[PDB]
Amino acid sequence: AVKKFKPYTPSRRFMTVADFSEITKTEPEKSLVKPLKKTGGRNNQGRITVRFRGGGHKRLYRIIDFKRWDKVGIPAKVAAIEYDPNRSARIALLHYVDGEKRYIIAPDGLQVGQQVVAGPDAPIQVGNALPLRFIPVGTVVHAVELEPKKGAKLARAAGTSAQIQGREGDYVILRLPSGELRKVHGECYATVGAVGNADHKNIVLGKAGRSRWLGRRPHVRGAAMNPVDHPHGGGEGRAPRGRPPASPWGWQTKGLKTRKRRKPSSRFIIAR
Amino acid sequence: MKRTWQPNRRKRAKTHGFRARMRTPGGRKVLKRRRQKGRWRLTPAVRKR
RNA sequence: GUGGGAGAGGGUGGUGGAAUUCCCGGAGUAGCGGUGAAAUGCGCAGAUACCGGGAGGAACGCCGAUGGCGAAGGCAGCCACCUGGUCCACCCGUGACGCUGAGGCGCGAAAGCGUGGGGAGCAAACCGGAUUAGAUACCCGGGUAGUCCACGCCCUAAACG
RNA sequence: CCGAGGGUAGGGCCCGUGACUGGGGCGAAGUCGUAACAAGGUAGCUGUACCGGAAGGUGCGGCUGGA
RNA sequence: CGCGGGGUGGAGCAGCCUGGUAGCUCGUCGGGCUCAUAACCCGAAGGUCGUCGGUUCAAAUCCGGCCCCCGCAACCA
RNA sequence: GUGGUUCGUGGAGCCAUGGGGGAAUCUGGGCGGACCACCGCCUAAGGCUAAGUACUCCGGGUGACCGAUAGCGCACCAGUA
RNA sequence: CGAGCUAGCCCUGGCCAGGGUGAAGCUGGGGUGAGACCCAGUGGAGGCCCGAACCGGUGGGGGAUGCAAACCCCUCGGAUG
RNA sequence: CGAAUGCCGGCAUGAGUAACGAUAAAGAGGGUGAGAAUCCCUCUCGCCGUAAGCCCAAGGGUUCCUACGCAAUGGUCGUCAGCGUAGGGUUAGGCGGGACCUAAGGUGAAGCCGAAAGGCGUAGCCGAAGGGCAGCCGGUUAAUAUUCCGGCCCUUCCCGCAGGUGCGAUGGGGGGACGCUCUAGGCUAGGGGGACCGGAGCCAUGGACGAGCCCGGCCAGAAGCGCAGGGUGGGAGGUAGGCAAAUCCGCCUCCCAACAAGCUCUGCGUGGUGGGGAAGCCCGUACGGGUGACAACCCCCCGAAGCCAGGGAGCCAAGAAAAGCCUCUAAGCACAACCUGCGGGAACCCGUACCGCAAACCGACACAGGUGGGCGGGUGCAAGAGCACUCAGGCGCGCGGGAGAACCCUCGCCAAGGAACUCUGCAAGUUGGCCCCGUAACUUCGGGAGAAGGGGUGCUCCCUGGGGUGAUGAGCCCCGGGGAGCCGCAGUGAACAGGCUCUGGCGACUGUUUACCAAAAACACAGCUCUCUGCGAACUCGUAAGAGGAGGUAUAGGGAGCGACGCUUGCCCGGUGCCGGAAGGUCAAGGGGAGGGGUGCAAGCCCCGAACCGAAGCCCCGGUGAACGGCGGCCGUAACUAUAACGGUCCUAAGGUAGCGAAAUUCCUUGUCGGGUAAGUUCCGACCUGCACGAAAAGCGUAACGACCGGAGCGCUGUCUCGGCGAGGGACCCGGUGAAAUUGAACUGGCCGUGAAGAUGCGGCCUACCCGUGGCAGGACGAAAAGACCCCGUGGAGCUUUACUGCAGC
RNA sequence: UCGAUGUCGGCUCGUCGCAUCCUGGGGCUGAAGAAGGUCCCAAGGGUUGGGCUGUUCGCCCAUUAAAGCGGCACGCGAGCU
């Protein structure tokens, strides 16, 4: 989708909005299973650690289910599909037959009315979740766990997905939304299908405000400020850095790798 | 234009208050000295009810 | 109409080996590549040559033919689904409802453009090596848009019988 | 009231004109290379796209006006 | 005015700083191949080294004086 | 690796130690300025211990000390206005 | 010791007269094979428009031991973000 | 002590000078009084009036009220006061705060961390203009009142009786409970009219004894009705989730509704009864009191932004929590308890005065400044919180009187010209609101656009079509059209109310910034691109524990540059940086001991110490520029001259492409040619010889936007020729109060000399009676600041880097 | 003169020198006349309006009897911009 606009105001011409057709007549969220008071704040205890944040629409947290072995075997019916301000993926709310309700990040396909479930059993269909081993090599899938019982963590962004590649001992090779081939443990669930609402990468914010709404204040270039507060700074009419591009704190930012070398997680990785 | 003193009872006891100064090691010393110097008033005289 | 027939005609989805390139494991050295001849180039940090495993993309050998189909462009591994045209027999039905077609309207290789994906081989531009008086070329080694896909544009051709 | 004509103002069309610039034509015997015609010494021609002092080159696809 | 760089056969460049020995590409001349010109092949010629001085036995080469040439600085007021 | 000592790595011991190795019970251990030999001195890794020394919010004495611009910031309702 | 000025941010409350302009989406009619699309009427968008409060502080002028250690008059910018 | 721009204190000078804090404005009579422009009174006048009037909040803390008072405080006066002395004055179960709750944030048992002091921290507490929660209207005081009193109306507790029910939790669930903008229906507040009703009155000056002028025609109100609207389905089986249990909730499943039909709950009428009550006239106030009055206390019309409120429609950025309240159960208990009536008793603490856009708060001051929320009437102007006048209510701004010079400020007008003014139309003018005609290039199809340029605009009569409320009608009120005619110089007759265009530069655009000299072409910005980060992420803070990132997960997050959009972004990896290289070469600790030394008679004990093995870094090998950067010189050549498509040669890592170019970059320079002018160092279009453009420190464009900057034309003008008058506030004069910086001391003249080279002061001559007031600024190297540039001092700070040396971090 | 002497231009107000731009007088002329050249005497008065530039300055435009050079802290900021 992606709503468009006629130019009746510069900016609201290039501006592009999402299409909330996929939003089952829902909107008002569900008390109980979410929401919780969401403590918004751009800095830690005192100081500001991440810069340029703050401001932007008030938000309510939708406490989603990111570990599904909670209900192994208990099937549930997908009730609605709603908007979640805390993420890029739309989310689906679903009523188990157990009578319990919980939200799930909604996969592309999954339609309201559908029945979905989790566990070793589970049929390989959009929405169902199973330990990685039991999933057919090659099938795509989202909401992966990295270590058994620790909760989903990979491919959860709007319309992202990972594809299974092979098996190898108690591990199974994956291919993350980034292109890295990772070795994940067999016992990590991963609900099947891709995340959906993949038009998300196409929304043209539009104006200055639009960014402000999502809570992101203006970002000033180092080049603009002085030597006192950033490498690229001073002296006359602009300047060409004058040294290898660096961050406010001073480490190179055009090429310098960061992953800490001797990490134990190294051996389970294979790509880029 | 607007100036720098905008009186506020709450802020004043809340900041230069007595329990305020007792709470920290530096403030307790603030008291010591003032006590040791004589000062009729150890801390500002906030008021009302 | 009834009943049959051929076909790479169109769309969508799914799928099979062959080979190429990269990757790792093996084992093996002293050269491989390349041309008219050579050099660039690749290689004792282990190349080329062989075995095994893996990834991925594109094109689909033999069948293939001077063949079939399509209105033109064009269309080829294999499977299913949805679909158009089309020839035959039976002479059953309507009963002149026909031809053409300014304009409009859709279609329309390749290259090009847009936003997103993909990217193996090839490959403008470009980089070296030869060749020449000089080569911005023909040859050689590299190599990016592109070629591939989705939606959207563009409307050209020796769109040629 | 209307009203020739006059006046204010903005458009349409058409002709002359202008530093300078893009191409085109013509101008017996100036410069540079040789692309085409013989297989033209790289078959050519092409729509197109990039590049080159210039003819041009090369990329993708088509054609016989060639093998 | 000041700083440093440079004048070499016809053209463009080496040659010095560690003084004795001028080298390269082109061009020019004679000869070949071609019907002829170019290419290509065979041979040959050409340099008071910007000038006036001395330094040494000996100066393109070391050192001062001028003749042009090129580049850099001419700031605070 | 360092601190302490006069000791700034110096021939740098002794006394404290963060790190790592890691003993012995008198024929056992330390020290006497690298080290070794004699010759000597001491007995580490538990603790307590008066008096002699410091100071002066406070009390009394004395001043070749001040005398209200001095002497404490204040002689006086000052850490006050 | 200070964020009772000022800068950001967090929590929770308020404020924005009155006018213009009229997006999408609807409904209707046109159109077609079904469309795209076109008309109306409707609707009421927007870091839109005019301009008070409210927030600024553009040009000039006065003030310059001032009314004022930044002020006054005229004039001007934003004014549902 | 004579000087230190010395310290402290006192007193001079300027000086009776400048001032007396908004140009809203005063006059007179009468009082009082020792003494009035300045106090009381009254009469007249002027100012505000979406306030300069009321009402809350903060803050202030006696300022409130009374009497008695002027020495000081008042910018003069003062009998007055916000001042001095003293006495009084602030009434609450219902308004606000607490014995209710929770947000950020604080705190903090547990837990963790830290040389110490301390840092962190789920549970619990605290934290308020948020949620919850029971009061309306009048009367009284010199001063308080939703507090006192009157009428009416509510709330919890406790103890009784009288009934009902399994009652019962800090535990389960429900609810409370939420954005923006646009909105409906009906109400209320509030406002207009009235021939009707109620009133003391009044014919003024030529007319009017009249549906005449004037004044007012309400307010609260329990139950119960009535009119609006808000909420919510009822049964019944089945259950494995709501961390125990539930009959409640959730989820299947059948019934009946699908409606508000029924319960509720709000507000809004009406309601027993209760209270108000104008002008004007009489009074005595500092003010209110009495008559009016047995007051009347009714019909329409406008109507909210407020109420019904958890109303609805849309949209995207997707919009607190906890308690009260309802229900469900556990222990316990079921002679308890809790529910509904009904009585009777109990209801604490603190705030209440007054100021509160201001003389009581913030600004040293009775300071033209600043300060959150609510009410803010009428008329006309298209509308309004705009504007002009005026309600109620509050004011005339705590120095006056005259004068009527210069000059200043603020304002008005002007002959002829109209930009000649000037750095520049700077300023001032013109133009302005509304309705209707009519509008270009360009363009991203919206815009440009209020383009431009034009007409209409008052009042009277006639005729006529729509709405609303009433009933399909009167009235009442809102909108339309036509037709005649009237008067002015002029009809948005006063106030509020764009000058317009053409063409460059820059940045897309709304936005932001140097609080107190810079609002821009600067920052920001959507958008692009590079690059890091697989999650106990990267990165940032912190010694840590921690925390942000993020309760996110590659369509996400950190860093960097460019900056909408269009068309594009060419070459060099030689140096630097980053990336990729299980080879090497070097390389520290440590491994290793060939071998040498010191002592011992010795066994021993003590030092050195070579091969060799030893990382990361570096060297070396590759790659990468939307990484740091860079992107040539000299000669020759065309059948006119000229010039070079062609060539040679030297050096590069490669040798600037497109596109732009005398530019926001052009030194020479006003390059040269065209355009604009009578004339054009600027501007505009060209040319290219680019001192010294050029492709993400982006190149060249661009509709639109702009308090940006340049050029130009129209229009209009006191900008100017070139001034002139007038106005008001000062200046001037008298009375009252009365500063300041400065100052070696002063009996302080010109010329020409002279001197440390710029003389009132030394020289000669010249002039020159003593002392003032208004003026002008040439001088006193006038005042103000131990010069802010310059240099010096082995002075200091901020910044940079392949300067030296450390340090954190890796 | 650095315990401060404000600095280019414009403007307003002027004053002075004369090595005179005009007009007054004159000698010589290669001065027929007219209009010129050139010198000598003479400052008494006059010595314009625009275009461009911050400009001094110059360059032009339309005139003029002429469109003089200089000094006065590149006169003049307790007078202005």
Ligand SMILES: [Mg+2]
């Ligand atoms: Mg909730």
Ligand SMILES: [Mg+2]
């Ligand atoms: Mg803290």
Ligand SMILES: [Mg+2]
């Ligand atoms: Mg930025």
Ligand SMILES: [Mg+2]
């Ligand atoms: Mg800066």
Ligand SMILES: [Mg+2]
């Ligand atoms: Mg820096």
Ligand SMILES: [Mg+2]
């Ligand atoms: Mg038949």
Ligand SMILES: [Mg+2]
């Ligand atoms: Mg017939």
Ligand SMILES: [Mg+2]
């Ligand atoms: Mg046909």
Ligand SMILES: [Mg+2]
């Ligand atoms: Mg096509």
Ligand SMILES: [Mg+2]
């Ligand atoms: Mg194609």
Ligand SMILES: [Mg+2]
């Ligand atoms: Mg994109």
Ligand SMILES: [Mg+2]
């Ligand atoms: Mg290739």
Ligand SMILES: [Mg+2]
């Ligand atoms: Mg050749």
Ligand SMILES: [Mg+2]
């Ligand atoms: Mg090739």
Ligand SMILES: [Mg+2]
């Ligand atoms: Mg053909």
Ligand SMILES: [Mg+2]
């Ligand atoms: Mg023309």
